[PDB]
Amino acid sequence: MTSSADLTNLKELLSLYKSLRFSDSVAIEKYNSLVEWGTSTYWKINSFQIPDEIRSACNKVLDSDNGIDFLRFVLLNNRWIMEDAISKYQSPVNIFKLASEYGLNIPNYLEIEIEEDTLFDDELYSIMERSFDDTFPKISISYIKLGELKRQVVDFFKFSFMYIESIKVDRIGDNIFIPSVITKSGKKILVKDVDHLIRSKVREHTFVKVKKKNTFSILYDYDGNGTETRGEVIKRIIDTIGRDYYVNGKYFSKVGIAGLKQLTNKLDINECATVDELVDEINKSGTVKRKIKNQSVFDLSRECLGYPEADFITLVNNMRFKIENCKVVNFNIENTNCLNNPSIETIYGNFNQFVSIFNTVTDVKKRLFE
Amino acid sequence: MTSSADLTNLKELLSLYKSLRFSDSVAIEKYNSLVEWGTSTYWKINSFQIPDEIRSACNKVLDSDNGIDFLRFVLLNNRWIMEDAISKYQSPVNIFKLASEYGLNIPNYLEIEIEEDTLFDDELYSIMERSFDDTFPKISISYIKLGELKRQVVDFFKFSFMYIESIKVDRIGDNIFIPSVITKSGKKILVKDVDHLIRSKVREHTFVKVKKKNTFSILYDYDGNGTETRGEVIKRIIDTIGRDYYVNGKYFSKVGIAGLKQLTNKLDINECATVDELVDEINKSGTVKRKIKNQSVFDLSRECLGYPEADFITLVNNMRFKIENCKVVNFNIENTNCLNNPSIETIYGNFNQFVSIFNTVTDVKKRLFE
């Protein structure tokens, strides 16, 4: 009832099971048939970097069914609100509960049992809309029918032209802000990130397409006559936001102790909340002092920010400056073409942080070999 | 006067000279200094596939000075008209003469000796414009100052709105055509390739931007409100050109014996100008007959055209057909979304050739095992 034949079949399963990733075709078809046979005899056979707070719970709930290949999160308001995962056999009904058990933000799952496949209308979405209470701006009303791995998607909306007057920031978390487009008619409009704002060509004192929906209203993508190149937009908005914010990831952040933070990082020392604490920690560290001594404020304050080696220079050589006491007080870029390079604008938006850490390292280097 | 030291220096030059491609930095700086020393002691230390007619002469004239890293050709009217090459020390004055000696099309080099760097005006370009006699549509008036590796570029022009009425082909070579936009005012307008035409939202019976210049007038790129997706354009133009042309490279070509040509290619046989010659050559070839027998007209007439394996199917499954005697007489695609894929439109434009070779292989397979 157990022979050598089954042994041979399972041996081939053994050998090619973890060569399945890139096997040859006959192996994959044989495996489809041998998972078949063994199951009745042997019973076993555009998103970006999500930091770890979510990846831990992801690693747990992916153990709930090995058909799960990814998890689908909506990033909103600096929150990862899962809605489902790409599973092959497990209906997400356990999955959102699990993700709730593992610290993943889930929505208010108010799913009307649908018998006949239908698309929702005025009430059919409105009433669920009240019942949802989405402090998160999620506008896709989708219903999962259990028995499938897809969904029914309903959403209705208008669009018009709104007259912007100015652009703002709005704190949403720790030191983090978003743009709230302010209109000549006293209304605020939302966007997703900084790059949504950029892509829009958003400026002041004109009309633009906006998609108006009842619970939320979102600044509509762009469709018009674009002659205003990207760099001009980047420069304009970087000035408009103010000189106190740099751009971290999808968001802003004020310049502050994070400079001392990164710097203490780069020199293998303890956290120093103030500057004299820093100079002390350096001074007692003969190696850190002696490895500052050989360097320049410029090379060091750019190595503490990881700009690659060179294109930094194509930037630097494109602006004029204002210095006293060997210390930057002002600066301004005058040729805007370089910003049209991708690797360039990531450095440009991230500049005021570099200026500040530069002044700081200047000061410590002055007072240390003082 | 020759010692062991020089031996050591040249040995390092020897070792790292052809590691220079990806050496480490000290090696490259040492090499900069040792090319220096040895030269006084040892005296030695968006273009696409250009077919070989030009690459042979390229390989010769790149031997004229090893500072030459590429050659810059302007492709025009199915001709590779060189204008210079990226040389580091050799002024192109010998290079265009060389390229003339090796069968490379050169322009009419009428260069006014400039003393003071200046930009040309009405006469200053016009007179040279007559003297040039460019049966090729090259509009860049650039002057090389000898003593540099750059140029002075002058060109002035207007633009307006022209009312197209229809679109045409125009034979330029062997079996090759171009589009000549025909306007409601009886004028013809030029373009570079098919893709210029595509990325031009070109249709019938409306106004579009055109850049008007004295000797040539060129259909201006697009800048307007684009809501008409790419696939719709592809379909429209493929129909407009006619059912007798497929798209080879940047150009068109009539369907014809090239089918028999490619087919004879794929089956390792002699050229057969007519179909019965073909059936004979197959019939006497027992191996070729016997390797047709196992196949299907479809798989074979798609292998003779190299469509990869699969997306062909996403195409095929998107159109309706018209067959008699197991032989396609008509077809028409009804879902246009797939054309927005790049690998898809290259197959779509190249279709009528496939239809024709399909009918042919059907016929030979019928008459052979007849």
XYZ file of C-alpha atoms in Angstrom:
740
model
C 0.000 0.000 0.000
C 3.236 1.867 0.273
C 5.755 0.688 -2.314
C 8.797 2.082 -4.094
C 6.776 3.840 -6.819
C 5.282 6.428 -4.464
C 8.804 6.857 -3.141
C 9.949 7.754 -6.659
C 7.110 10.218 -7.257
C 7.745 11.982 -3.947
C 11.485 12.008 -4.666
C 10.859 13.958 -7.859
C 8.525 16.267 -5.942
C 11.300 16.680 -3.363
C 13.928 17.527 -5.950
C 11.983 20.008 -8.030
C 9.713 21.538 -5.374
C 12.129 24.334 -4.554
C 13.444 24.430 -8.113
C 9.847 25.348 -9.025
C 10.917 29.008 -8.983
C 12.625 28.703 -12.378
C 12.263 25.081 -13.476
C 11.721 23.869 -17.009
C 8.200 23.310 -18.318
C 7.911 19.514 -17.979
C 8.942 19.864 -14.334
C 6.154 22.374 -13.660
C 3.510 20.223 -15.348
C 4.736 17.095 -13.552
C 4.535 19.112 -10.330
C 0.962 20.151 -11.076
C 0.120 16.460 -11.427
C 2.154 15.317 -8.425
C 0.784 17.923 -6.021
C -2.429 16.343 -7.316
C -1.460 12.776 -6.430
C 0.424 13.499 -3.218
C -2.358 15.610 -1.736
C -4.446 12.443 -1.380
C -1.485 10.451 -0.098
C 1.063 12.814 1.503
C -1.055 15.877 2.370
C 1.773 18.406 1.934
C 3.723 19.536 -1.108
C 2.900 50.142 -7.723
C 3.816 50.051 -4.036
C 7.139 50.914 -2.411
C 9.169 50.340 0.746
C 6.782 49.616 3.601
C 8.738 49.945 6.866
C 8.649 47.194 9.406
C 5.687 48.166 11.623
C 3.482 46.796 8.848
C 5.836 44.125 7.532
C 5.829 42.199 10.813
C 2.044 41.832 10.830
C 2.319 41.157 7.094
C 4.673 38.269 7.815
C 2.219 36.885 10.347
C -0.978 37.113 8.298
C 0.793 35.686 5.247
C 1.017 32.492 7.317
C -2.795 32.284 7.426
C -2.986 30.809 3.905
C -0.026 30.106 1.634
C -2.074 31.345 -1.301
C -1.362 34.833 0.060
C 1.288 36.407 -2.184
C 0.999 40.070 -1.164
C -1.092 42.380 0.993
C -2.833 45.399 -0.525
C -2.538 48.537 1.599
C -3.894 52.000 0.913
C -1.512 54.646 2.235
C -3.533 57.544 3.598
C -2.717 60.430 5.916
C 0.488 58.670 6.978
C -1.399 55.451 7.692
C -1.252 51.999 6.085
C -4.934 51.010 5.922
C -5.091 47.462 4.611
C -8.203 46.471 2.686
C -7.329 42.928 1.598
C -4.520 40.689 0.399
C -3.864 38.781 -2.804
C -4.874 35.340 -1.582
C -5.614 32.359 -3.795
C -7.955 30.359 -1.559
C -8.545 32.247 1.707
C -11.404 34.728 1.549
C -10.257 37.969 3.221
C -13.004 37.652 5.819
C -10.516 36.097 8.228
C -7.720 38.256 6.879
C -8.981 41.655 7.960
C -9.773 40.210 11.388
C -6.255 38.772 11.566
C -4.709 42.066 10.463
C -6.723 43.650 13.259
C -5.275 41.075 15.679
C -1.741 41.965 14.531
C -1.984 45.761 14.604
C -2.970 46.513 11.015
C -5.442 49.312 10.402
C -8.572 47.840 8.827
C -11.636 49.661 7.497
C -15.223 49.446 8.681
C -16.247 46.270 6.869
C -19.957 46.920 6.249
C -20.658 44.525 3.405
C -24.250 44.007 2.218
C -24.818 40.392 1.250
C -25.369 40.651 -2.509
C -27.289 37.856 -4.203
C -27.564 39.155 -7.771
C -24.484 40.950 -9.038
C -25.375 44.646 -9.099
C -23.818 48.121 -8.999
C -24.792 50.449 -6.146
C -26.781 53.683 -6.641
C -27.767 56.803 -4.706
C -28.877 55.182 -1.478
C -27.103 51.902 -2.238
C -23.814 53.677 -1.679
C -24.907 56.716 0.340
C -26.326 54.788 3.286
C -23.216 52.624 3.462
C -21.308 55.898 3.187
C -22.801 57.182 6.423
C -22.430 53.802 8.111
C -18.734 53.648 7.228
C -17.452 56.759 9.063
C -14.134 56.930 7.214
C -11.895 59.373 9.028
C -9.614 58.074 6.308
C -10.208 59.450 2.793
C -11.024 56.156 1.069
C -13.587 56.660 -1.679
C -13.672 53.251 -3.371
C -16.880 51.456 -2.429
C -16.016 47.878 -3.360
C -17.905 44.753 -2.349
C -16.322 41.311 -2.171
C -18.577 38.447 -3.112
C -17.456 35.397 -1.148
C -16.798 32.602 -3.615
C -14.500 34.725 -5.788
C -11.138 36.504 -5.588
C -12.289 39.793 -7.213
C -14.618 42.670 -6.364
C -17.466 44.925 -7.520
C -16.361 48.577 -7.673
C -18.751 51.536 -7.460
C -17.972 55.246 -7.261
C -19.712 58.289 -8.722
C -18.545 61.869 -8.681
C -18.387 65.140 -10.575
C -15.587 67.484 -11.521
C -15.331 71.230 -12.029
C -12.869 74.119 -11.982
C -11.776 75.663 -8.692
C -9.878 78.925 -8.312
C -6.829 78.455 -6.096
C -5.529 81.472 -4.200
C -2.620 79.898 -2.276
C -1.079 76.682 -0.969
C -0.428 75.579 2.576
C 0.953 72.908 4.889
C -1.035 71.111 7.589
C 0.441 69.044 10.393
C -0.816 65.476 10.319
C 1.650 63.762 12.590
C 4.993 64.212 14.293
C 6.647 67.057 12.386
C 4.887 66.064 9.162
C 2.635 68.147 6.930
C 0.547 67.952 3.774
C -0.627 70.535 1.231
C -4.160 71.879 1.585
C -4.927 73.876 -1.545
C -6.738 77.028 -0.426
C -9.326 78.401 -2.843
C -10.577 81.902 -3.513
C -13.951 80.629 -2.262
C -12.664 79.594 1.172
C -12.563 75.830 0.631
C -9.656 73.452 1.216
C -8.662 70.716 -1.248
C -6.674 67.535 -0.565
C -3.865 65.685 -2.348
C -1.921 62.492 -1.743
C 1.774 63.411 -1.499
C 4.191 66.041 -2.681
C 4.515 64.461 -6.113
C 0.768 64.576 -6.673
C 1.102 68.305 -6.039
C 4.043 68.549 -8.442
C 2.448 66.555 -11.257
C -0.481 68.991 -11.051
C 1.514 72.131 -11.977
C -0.382 73.674 -9.064
C 0.170 77.418 -8.767
C -1.684 80.433 -7.422
C -4.646 82.455 -8.623
C -6.154 80.381 -11.407
C -8.717 77.672 -12.103
C -7.917 73.957 -12.217
C -9.790 70.676 -12.524
C -10.998 69.234 -9.220
C -12.977 66.031 -8.749
C -15.846 66.837 -6.378
C -17.316 64.005 -4.306
C -19.701 64.205 -1.373
C -17.524 63.103 1.538
C -14.152 64.162 0.095
C -13.049 66.437 -2.729
C -9.716 65.736 -4.388
C -7.617 67.926 -6.642
C -7.975 66.351 -10.052
C -4.965 65.165 -11.988
C -3.786 67.463 -14.760
C -4.872 67.360 -18.422
C -4.224 70.854 -19.843
C -1.539 72.556 -21.956
C 1.758 71.982 -20.176
C 4.572 74.329 -21.199
C 5.880 74.992 -17.664
C 8.703 72.485 -17.209
C 9.054 70.420 -14.026
C 12.015 72.215 -12.482
C 10.192 75.528 -12.424
C 7.397 73.881 -10.466
C 9.857 72.256 -8.068
C 11.570 75.561 -7.356
C 8.303 77.443 -6.947
C 6.823 75.010 -4.471
C 10.043 74.578 -2.505
C 10.046 78.320 -1.955
C 6.329 78.515 -1.236
C 6.303 75.866 1.502
C 8.863 77.904 3.401
C 12.516 77.659 4.372
C 11.789 75.563 7.458
C 10.718 72.315 5.782
C 12.601 69.745 3.804
C 11.021 66.802 2.029
C 11.297 63.385 3.668
C 9.716 60.613 1.616
C 6.192 61.531 0.557
C 5.989 64.278 3.151
C 7.632 67.326 4.679
C 9.487 67.767 7.951
C 10.824 70.734 9.894
C 14.561 71.144 10.242
C 15.653 70.583 13.806
C 17.530 68.229 16.104
C 17.329 65.603 13.350
C 20.522 67.228 12.139
C 22.354 66.481 15.373
C 20.634 63.118 15.236
C 22.009 62.074 11.850
C 25.376 63.573 12.706
C 25.722 61.645 15.969
C 24.728 58.659 13.855
C 27.558 59.129 11.371
C 30.314 59.435 13.968
C 29.502 56.421 16.192
C 28.721 58.316 19.387
C 25.910 58.840 21.850
C 22.873 61.018 21.174
C 23.569 64.668 21.984
C 20.513 66.879 22.332
C 22.544 70.116 22.367
C 25.655 71.270 20.560
C 28.065 71.597 23.473
C 27.182 68.099 24.574
C 28.266 67.157 21.089
C 31.590 69.004 21.229
C 32.309 67.279 24.543
C 31.537 63.817 23.216
C 33.813 64.520 20.262
C 36.614 65.984 22.362
C 36.765 63.024 24.735
C 36.725 60.740 21.692
C 40.295 61.101 20.425
C 39.512 58.981 17.381
C 36.433 60.995 16.390
C 38.255 64.300 16.843
C 41.222 62.932 14.897
C 38.925 61.735 12.103
C 37.203 65.099 11.913
C 40.533 66.927 11.769
C 41.411 65.637 8.328
C 38.099 66.561 6.747
C 36.250 69.534 5.327
C 32.930 70.856 6.557
C 31.577 70.349 3.049
C 32.599 66.754 2.407
C 31.509 65.775 5.886
C 28.142 67.508 5.888
C 27.419 65.906 2.552
C 28.544 62.439 3.612
C 26.195 62.662 6.574
C 23.401 63.016 3.989
C 24.487 60.409 1.456
C 24.431 62.480 -1.740
C 26.200 60.156 -4.137
C 29.470 61.774 -5.051
C 29.124 64.173 -7.929
C 25.782 65.480 -9.213
C 25.732 67.327 -5.918
C 28.345 69.474 -7.647
C 26.195 70.167 -10.686
C 23.703 71.461 -8.179
C 26.118 73.481 -6.071
C 27.654 75.065 -9.167
C 24.207 76.296 -10.203
C 23.366 78.566 -7.286
C 24.667 81.726 -5.672
C 25.190 82.047 -1.950
C 25.370 84.341 1.076
C 27.982 83.681 3.753
C 29.248 85.389 6.862
C 31.662 83.939 9.397
C 32.213 81.093 6.949
C 28.583 80.222 7.506
C 25.739 80.088 5.009
C 22.922 82.493 5.681
C 21.267 82.519 2.273
C 21.320 80.864 -1.123
C 19.400 80.785 -4.374
C 19.518 78.658 -7.521
C 19.491 80.513 -10.830
C 19.576 77.826 -13.552
C 16.542 75.559 -13.347
C 17.368 72.983 -16.009
C 19.215 70.556 -13.732
C 16.070 69.942 -11.657
C 14.589 68.114 -14.647
C 16.979 65.298 -13.755
C 15.432 62.865 -11.246
C 18.557 62.290 -9.137
C 18.875 66.081 -8.913
C 15.495 67.107 -7.521
C 15.717 64.543 -4.740
C 18.800 66.450 -3.620
C 17.278 69.864 -4.186
C 14.148 69.333 -2.118
C 16.311 67.913 0.666
C 18.549 70.964 0.901
C 17.639 73.097 3.895
C 18.513 70.165 6.120
C 21.965 70.136 4.528
C 22.401 73.876 5.030
C 21.551 73.544 8.707
C 23.811 70.591 9.377
C 26.535 72.515 7.535
C 26.303 75.484 9.852
C 26.329 73.124 12.822
C 29.400 71.172 11.740
C 31.156 74.445 10.964
C 30.500 75.542 14.506
C 31.673 72.354 16.175
C 34.813 72.240 14.037
C 35.520 75.833 14.983
C 35.064 75.314 18.698
C 36.857 71.971 18.794
C 40.225 72.919 17.296
C 39.578 76.237 19.004
C 69.242 55.902 -19.690
C 67.055 52.862 -19.662
C 66.976 51.226 -16.234
C 64.641 48.991 -14.255
C 62.487 51.869 -12.963
C 61.006 52.693 -16.369
C 60.443 48.963 -16.721
C 58.352 49.044 -13.541
C 56.309 52.067 -14.627
C 55.553 50.523 -18.020
C 54.713 47.213 -16.337
C 52.013 48.929 -14.299
C 50.798 50.668 -17.453
C 50.747 47.250 -19.136
C 48.750 45.629 -16.363
C 46.098 48.277 -15.871
C 45.827 49.676 -19.411
C 43.064 47.294 -20.414
C 41.684 47.181 -16.881
C 41.120 50.929 -17.374
C 37.523 50.118 -18.347
C 36.509 49.555 -14.715
C 39.639 50.032 -12.608
C 39.793 51.591 -9.174
C 40.486 55.306 -8.792
C 44.200 55.248 -7.898
C 44.810 53.141 -11.005
C 43.102 55.715 -13.236
C 45.032 58.625 -11.732
C 48.321 56.712 -11.949
C 47.432 56.002 -15.582
C 46.801 59.683 -16.258
C 50.296 60.373 -14.935
C 51.956 57.430 -16.681
C 50.454 58.120 -20.103
C 52.060 61.480 -19.304
C 55.523 60.072 -18.626
C 55.516 57.314 -21.231
C 54.427 59.605 -24.053
C 57.842 61.282 -23.887
C 59.630 57.956 -23.541
C 57.488 55.175 -25.067
C 55.210 57.088 -27.470
C 52.252 54.697 -27.142
C 49.957 53.880 -24.243
C 19.329 58.556 -28.846
C 20.385 56.516 -31.874
C 19.535 52.909 -32.698
C 20.706 49.954 -34.777
C 22.632 51.269 -37.767
C 22.999 48.403 -40.266
C 26.368 47.523 -41.645
C 26.599 49.682 -44.795
C 27.397 52.569 -42.454
C 29.134 50.598 -39.712
C 31.937 49.452 -42.014
C 32.891 53.009 -42.961
C 32.350 53.891 -39.301
C 34.907 51.263 -38.316
C 37.366 52.705 -40.813
C 37.041 56.393 -39.940
C 37.175 55.598 -36.221
C 40.767 54.543 -36.940
C 41.604 58.104 -38.034
C 41.955 59.314 -34.425
C 41.454 57.186 -31.320
C 39.728 60.126 -29.670
C 36.750 59.228 -31.871
C 34.168 57.521 -29.645
C 31.081 57.688 -31.879
C 29.898 59.122 -35.180
C 26.879 61.429 -35.318
C 24.527 60.662 -38.204
C 21.283 62.368 -39.134
C 18.817 59.850 -40.549
C 16.828 61.504 -43.316
C 14.689 60.168 -46.147
C 16.152 56.694 -45.613
C 19.695 58.065 -45.696
C 22.427 58.230 -43.046
C 23.896 61.711 -43.595
C 26.858 62.064 -41.264
C 27.704 65.561 -40.067
C 30.562 64.868 -37.650
C 31.854 62.456 -35.033
C 32.572 62.734 -31.326
C 36.337 63.103 -31.547
C 38.587 64.326 -28.759
C 41.516 65.719 -30.748
C 40.826 65.355 -34.486
C 38.903 68.260 -35.980
C 36.181 66.834 -38.255
C 37.704 68.595 -41.251
C 39.497 65.386 -42.197
C 36.615 63.294 -40.931
C 33.949 64.347 -43.403
C 36.472 63.927 -46.219
C 37.314 60.455 -44.911
C 33.639 59.534 -44.598
C 33.318 60.650 -48.208
C 36.240 58.361 -49.112
C 34.491 55.431 -47.392
C 30.987 55.861 -48.806
C 29.350 57.976 -46.108
C 26.929 60.675 -47.192
C 28.335 64.050 -46.153
C 26.711 67.478 -46.426
C 27.844 70.487 -48.422
C 30.444 71.843 -46.008
C 30.237 75.591 -46.705
C 31.738 77.013 -43.536
C 32.439 80.758 -43.295
C 35.633 81.389 -41.366
C 34.338 83.115 -38.227
C 36.759 85.303 -36.299
C 34.502 86.769 -33.605
C 31.939 84.358 -32.211
C 28.590 85.440 -33.652
C 25.108 84.138 -34.478
C 23.940 84.295 -38.102
C 21.068 86.527 -39.302
C 18.881 87.032 -42.370
C 21.559 86.968 -45.036
C 24.127 85.334 -42.748
C 22.104 82.148 -42.933
C 20.033 82.722 -46.078
C 22.964 83.021 -48.472
C 24.553 79.894 -47.032
C 21.090 78.367 -47.356
C 21.101 78.833 -51.115
C 24.728 77.749 -51.389
C 24.016 74.519 -49.512
C 21.445 72.908 -51.854
C 20.194 70.361 -49.322
C 18.092 67.812 -51.151
C 18.122 66.436 -47.631
C 15.862 68.191 -45.100
C 18.564 69.313 -42.667
C 17.668 72.640 -41.081
C 20.373 73.055 -38.435
C 22.856 75.688 -39.572
C 25.796 74.953 -37.287
C 29.341 76.239 -37.671
C 32.376 74.481 -36.227
C 35.142 76.744 -35.047
C 38.423 74.882 -35.469
C 40.197 74.873 -32.126
C 37.179 73.509 -30.246
C 35.030 70.369 -30.088
C 31.632 72.166 -30.055
C 29.557 74.273 -32.441
C 27.543 77.468 -32.957
C 23.888 76.686 -33.743
C 21.555 79.056 -35.599
C 18.006 78.474 -36.812
C 14.982 80.761 -37.010
C 11.444 79.856 -37.928
C 7.773 80.499 -37.284
C 4.837 78.285 -36.443
C 1.122 78.423 -37.177
C -1.971 76.248 -37.506
C -2.601 74.264 -40.680
C -5.853 72.538 -41.592
C -5.228 68.925 -42.574
C -7.694 67.272 -44.933
C -6.098 63.816 -45.320
C -2.927 61.754 -44.980
C -0.922 59.951 -47.614
C 2.068 57.755 -48.406
C 4.892 58.678 -50.783
C 7.448 56.271 -52.195
C 10.978 57.274 -51.274
C 12.883 54.120 -52.051
C 12.441 50.442 -52.801
C 8.927 49.647 -51.584
C 9.165 52.273 -48.842
C 6.891 55.235 -48.167
C 6.452 58.200 -45.846
C 3.443 60.269 -44.759
C 2.851 63.581 -46.517
C 0.150 65.414 -44.590
C -2.184 66.961 -47.164
C -3.793 70.256 -46.180
C -7.085 71.859 -47.106
C -4.973 74.583 -48.742
C -3.165 72.217 -51.122
C 0.192 72.072 -49.338
C 2.138 68.992 -48.250
C 3.805 68.670 -44.835
C 6.683 66.384 -43.822
C 7.432 64.179 -40.809
C 10.305 61.959 -39.734
C 8.926 58.437 -39.232
C 5.711 56.678 -38.380
C 6.104 57.362 -34.672
C 6.424 61.094 -35.253
C 3.060 60.798 -36.987
C 1.633 58.788 -34.088
C 2.900 61.063 -31.330
C 1.315 63.866 -33.332
C -2.384 63.180 -32.729
C -2.663 63.476 -36.493
C -6.179 63.079 -37.868
C -8.310 64.588 -40.611
C -10.100 67.891 -41.042
C -8.754 70.078 -38.260
C -6.009 72.566 -37.438
C -2.682 71.624 -35.858
C 0.608 73.303 -34.998
C 3.156 73.315 -37.819
C 6.624 74.852 -37.716
C 7.044 76.866 -40.922
C 10.565 77.435 -42.239
C 11.648 78.777 -45.610
C 13.217 75.731 -47.247
C 11.246 73.058 -45.363
C 8.077 73.040 -43.285
C 7.701 70.368 -40.627
C 4.626 69.221 -38.752
C 5.130 70.548 -35.256
C 5.178 68.239 -32.273
C 1.990 68.134 -30.227
C 1.152 70.315 -27.204
C -2.665 70.356 -26.924
C -5.333 68.582 -24.848
C -4.780 64.864 -25.335
C -7.745 62.662 -24.421
C -7.505 60.344 -27.456
C -5.465 57.380 -26.231
C -2.615 55.918 -28.300
C -4.307 52.733 -29.465
C -7.111 54.637 -31.144
C -4.523 56.566 -33.130
C -2.664 53.383 -34.051
C -5.828 51.731 -35.328
C -6.951 54.806 -37.243
C -3.679 55.281 -39.061
C -3.193 51.584 -39.784
C -6.541 51.626 -41.539
C -5.913 54.932 -43.289
C -2.591 53.935 -44.864
C -4.340 51.031 -46.545
C -4.398 47.251 -46.314
C -1.378 46.841 -48.585
C 1.337 48.191 -46.282
C 2.852 46.882 -43.112
C 5.332 48.766 -40.964
C 8.995 47.785 -41.208
C 11.230 49.767 -38.871
C 10.610 53.491 -39.212
C 8.846 53.026 -42.528
C 6.184 51.168 -44.470
C 6.464 48.401 -47.042
C 4.050 46.697 -49.416
C 3.174 43.073 -48.825
C 4.606 40.879 -51.534
C 7.213 38.237 -52.281
C 8.879 39.142 -48.976
C 6.476 36.598 -47.544
C 7.864 33.797 -49.689
C 11.258 35.271 -48.912
C 10.993 34.976 -45.130
C 9.307 31.607 -45.466
C 12.051 30.134 -47.652
C 14.376 31.568 -45.023
C 12.730 29.701 -42.159
C 12.788 26.288 -43.826
C 16.424 26.175 -45.036
C 15.735 26.016 -48.766
C 16.438 27.931 -51.942
C 14.673 31.149 -52.915
C 11.376 30.449 -54.680
C 9.892 33.363 -56.594
C 6.537 31.619 -57.148
C 4.408 29.313 -55.046
C 4.600 26.129 -57.100
C 8.360 26.410 -57.157
C 8.017 26.431 -53.404
C 5.794 23.348 -53.224
C 8.302 21.518 -55.421
C 11.276 22.464 -53.277
C 9.359 21.285 -50.222
C 8.172 18.055 -51.821
C 11.648 16.988 -52.914
C 12.878 17.853 -49.421
C 11.586 14.894 -47.405
C 12.780 16.473 -44.173
C 11.079 19.820 -44.820
C 7.820 18.147 -45.835
C 8.044 15.872 -42.794
C 8.687 18.860 -40.520
C 5.745 20.751 -41.965
C 3.451 17.749 -41.521
C 3.482 17.931 -37.747
C 2.662 21.621 -37.563
C -0.266 23.996 -37.806
C -0.604 26.828 -40.285
C -0.974 29.189 -37.337
C 2.047 28.212 -35.261
C 4.193 28.087 -38.364
C 3.103 31.376 -39.891
C 3.712 33.021 -36.552
C 7.112 31.416 -36.024
C 8.176 32.716 -39.417
C 7.506 36.200 -37.993
C 9.014 35.819 -34.533
C 6.110 37.005 -32.374
C 7.286 35.952 -28.941
C 4.967 33.240 -27.751
C 1.896 34.619 -26.071
C 0.813 38.268 -26.290
C 0.082 37.381 -29.888
C -2.876 35.581 -28.329
C -4.104 38.618 -26.430
C -4.162 40.261 -29.816
C -5.808 37.427 -31.717
C -8.480 37.045 -29.040
C -9.398 40.709 -29.487
C -10.513 40.716 -33.110
C -13.202 39.162 -35.262
C -12.459 37.507 -38.572
C -13.729 36.516 -42.014
C -12.714 33.157 -43.470
C -13.577 31.076 -46.487
C -11.834 27.903 -47.604
C -9.990 27.987 -44.289
C -8.423 31.196 -45.509
C -8.599 34.671 -44.014
C -10.206 37.268 -46.215
C -10.998 39.913 -43.623
C -10.479 40.841 -39.997
C -11.083 43.682 -37.583
C -10.057 44.441 -34.004
C -12.797 45.622 -31.662
C -11.111 46.242 -28.285
C -8.434 48.916 -28.553
C -6.950 48.825 -25.058
C -4.278 46.214 -25.771
C -2.570 48.498 -28.310
C -1.520 50.739 -25.417
C 1.014 48.028 -24.604
C 4.306 48.555 -26.469
C 4.986 44.895 -27.300
C 1.441 44.748 -28.690
C 1.439 47.568 -31.232
C 4.654 46.328 -32.805
C 2.709 43.165 -33.594
C -0.427 44.987 -34.662
C 1.198 47.267 -37.216
C 3.032 44.254 -38.635
C -0.122 42.240 -39.251
C -1.075 42.280 -42.917
C 2.215 40.576 -43.683
C 1.209 37.810 -41.279
C -2.224 37.459 -42.870
C -0.660 37.081 -46.302
C 1.955 34.556 -45.276
C -0.846 32.671 -43.509
C -2.897 32.334 -46.657
C 0.216 31.231 -48.525
C 1.232 28.550 -46.038
C -2.358 27.326 -45.952
C -2.213 26.892 -49.688
C 1.103 25.066 -49.787
C 0.061 22.761 -46.950
C -3.143 22.005 -48.814
C -1.458 21.233 -52.108
C 1.427 19.307 -50.566
C -0.455 16.646 -48.598
C -2.953 16.916 -51.432
